Design a protein around this ligand. Structure first.
Ligand SMILES: [Cl-]
Ligand SMILES: [Cl-]
Ligand code: NA
Ligand code: NA
Lengths: 457, 457
């Protein structure tokens, strides 16, 4: 009974339901925050009918910027703090709406891009996989208490991953090293350094399995060592217990005192005070990195669910080539979906035009005929769909009808129709559209690398 | 932090929210059952944002016919059994819709009868008190684990209570004894007998405080004593433990064996097997009634919340006179509400008629005027409301307009308007309407007395 993330949008059922539930409640990034309970209530009633705690815990995690590399929920109130991600207030107090980044997963939902599946009682439908515009699987990875999970995917930089996709679109046979010219490695939500060598980072992407080793970043100010950023999910308080324990065992005669000076706005500020300005700082820290959580490791095992529905230990190339296949399939359905709405709209205008051109008579037929609909159909050779649309027309909407506005919209649609057939008519034109959107989206939603990679940056 | 029932509809906030939530989800008695979770989810998200357990427990209680004298929820699945009302399945399995009786509390909700109050976060509104058509306060009383509660009101027969209301409407000064010519006493959901004397039942209604003593009903078949109905909320299994314990203490040499033969359809069937057909049955049972739960007592303390918002220990007369005041106020607003919709409708027809009588010109003005709305207003002396309604008219709706249908509906409404002004114009005409509805409603939703009162029936 373990959940594995889907390559498509990088989500597990728990997560997918919370976000879908929220976009259905209209809680997008432009909406006003609504009490968390409202969202939990919907998820509980419509999608996962077990409990308020299971759901809300996964939801709080999405709103924590130190848990998710790209948050999916924008939260107001107490949504926990860095050293204890469990100190979140009850759901009756916190308020939530979706993230701006959430748009990456949801903007294309109503455009025939999703495979709908019945919910738990068959009364509503839910998305099987969200139409992600960027590979959230690598961007956010597997977030939360990682010791329980078998599958581990670290987070990545959105812009680096997007550039690697561009590369595959241009050079379909680009090897993994070539993809690593753009993707430096993982990118965690912390200024801490990844010290794994480039050669090992490369093998991890070739294999799908490996290890990442991060290291806290420090500076010196007034002779005191100040750690400004810790490895991912490392408790600053736990680090102090560890150093303090060594002080008790007479292993740190060079350490005088420790102080946790992190405040509201400054999340990490652990001060290690040396016995004197004659203490070798770099020698001390090397020891602390080897003996405390100031240097911690992370597992990698990209065993995820693919488009064929079965799991696979996927290396970076295998994963991105497959994600691009998912993305192009998605964009193809988005265009097909639109083309259908354009063609239904052209059919209505073709009917509406005829009605406008014979409007005097149309209004006469409507006011003086036992069967008005069936009379217009026989007279002006209209389909039933055209006839209904004419009869649904209100008198205020009848006032605004102008022959040129009808032919003007009819022109726009005929050319938008030509554009869509050209895009669906060749793989080459899709590819450029996908490439074009990967680049805009990267500009819109992307950010600078946070965790530096010592082996490169 | 204790909840007291409101005289108006006899509900506490917990209860009121669950039913309102359910009628808002469209789960009335004509709708299809929907998974209990859906309802719990709404209550949790919109009205009481604490938990799935608190809400669902109160909800299960409403669906149990052996807990509520008049159930408010019709449930499918395992909604617990008589000897253990806690053996209900999880909310992801059970299904629920409202009761037929629920109509008594909800049919008048959308008719300006309720005082709306903001919900917990000020985003929606909830009813302060439901517009009950019958005094649910006495009909259902205070249901659930009564040891925790300070306020206790036993259930009553709907038809008996309705007749007492009629009596107060006819004889406003009718004394409590006179009200007791109709209300025999409490009426629990069990065939068991109430053995409290009539004189004490009378003092309890005069006081608002007292005690009810019920007794299990039995018959003899093939020499074995068969208890067919137990006092309210008495566990058949607990009774057997009690008798068995006496057998261990050598107090029942006349008792040979005990058997719980209750099945799916037969809720109570406890067989006490005497040592021989020579055992005095009535002498044995008298002893068991005095020494076991086969005869149990119930407290009464009608300390409820009145229309003035403050609590009061209310005797039967005080309570019913006040409930009738609530009922007439409710019906008065229901009529006022309707009268307003009739008058708005007459205003639209007055405008629609003029438009039909000058339709050739109206359609011309609509097709050839820079400002159509503002032109009709100046031409035919129409209010803005009338003008909008004309312009909203669809072409299919324009085909069905016939001068006689407009004047025909205009006649009906002018006479319905006259009826409503006559009812609101005197207390005497309201009273008869209230009386008339109390009687129909009693016929529709009422049933025979279940718990016989030995002192009378
Ligand atoms: Cl796992
Ligand atoms: Cl109480
Ligand atoms: Na792990
Ligand atoms: Na009590």
């Amino acid at each position: 009974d373990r959940a594995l993330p889907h390559i498509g949008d990088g989500l597990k059922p728990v997560q997918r339901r919370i976000v879908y539930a929220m976009s259905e409640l209209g809680l997008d990034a432009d909406a006003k925050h609504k009490k968390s309970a409202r969202t939990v209530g919907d998820v509980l009633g419509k999608f996962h009918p077990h409990g308020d705690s299971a759901c809300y815990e996964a939801m709080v995690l999405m709103a924590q910027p130190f848990s998710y590399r790209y948050t999916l929920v924008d939260g107001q109130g107490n949504w926990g703090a860095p050293d204890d991600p469990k100190s979140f207030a009850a759901m009756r107090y916190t308020e939530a709406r979706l993230s701006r980044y959430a748009e990456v997963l949801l903007s294309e939902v109503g455009q025939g891009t999703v495979d709908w599946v019945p919910n738990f009682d068959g009364t509503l439908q839910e998305p099987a996989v969200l139409p992600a515009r960027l590979p959230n699987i690598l961007l956010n990875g597997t977030t939360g208490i990682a010791v329980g999970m078998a599958t581990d995917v670290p987070p990545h930089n959105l812009r680096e991953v997007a550039s690697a996709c561009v590369r595959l679109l241009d050079e379909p046979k680009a090897t993994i090293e070539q993809l690593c010219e753009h993707i430096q490695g993982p990118d965690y939500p912390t200024e801490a350094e990844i010290v794994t060598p480039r050669a090992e980072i490369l093998k991890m992407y070739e294999s799908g399995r490996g290890s990442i080793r991060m290291r806290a970043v420090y500076r010196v100010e007034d002779g005191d060592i100040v750690v400004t950023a810790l490895p991912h999910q490392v408790s600053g308080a736990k680090v102090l217990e560890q150093i303090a324990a060594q002080m008790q065992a007479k292993k740190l005669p060079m350490v005088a005192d420790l102080r946790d000076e992190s405040d509201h706005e400054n999340p990490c500020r652990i001060v290690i005070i040396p016995r004197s300005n004659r203490v070798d700082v770099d020698e001390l820290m090397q020891h602390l990195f080897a003996t405390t959580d100031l240097e911690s490791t992370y597992r990698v095992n990209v065993n995820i669910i693919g488009l064929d529905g079965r799991p696979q230990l996927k290396n970076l190339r295998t994963l991105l080539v497959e994600w691009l296949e998912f993305r192009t399939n998605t964009v193809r359905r988005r265009l097909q979906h639109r083309l259908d709405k354009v063609e239904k709209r052209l059919h209505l205008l073709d009917g509406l035009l005829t009605a406008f051109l014979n409007l005097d008579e149309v209004i006469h037929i409507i006011r003086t005929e036992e069967y008005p609909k069936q009379a217009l159909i026989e007279r002006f050779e209209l389909t039933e769909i055209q006839a209904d649309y004419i009869l649904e027309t209100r008198l205020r909407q009848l006032a605004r009808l102008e022959e040129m506005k009808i032919r003007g919209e009819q022109d726009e649609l005929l050319k938008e129709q030509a554009k869509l057939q050209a895009l669906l008519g060749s793989e080459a034109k899709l590819r450029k559209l996908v490439r074009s959107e990967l680049i805009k989206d990267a500009e819109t939603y992307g950010d600078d690398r946070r965790s530096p990679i010592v082996a490169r940056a």
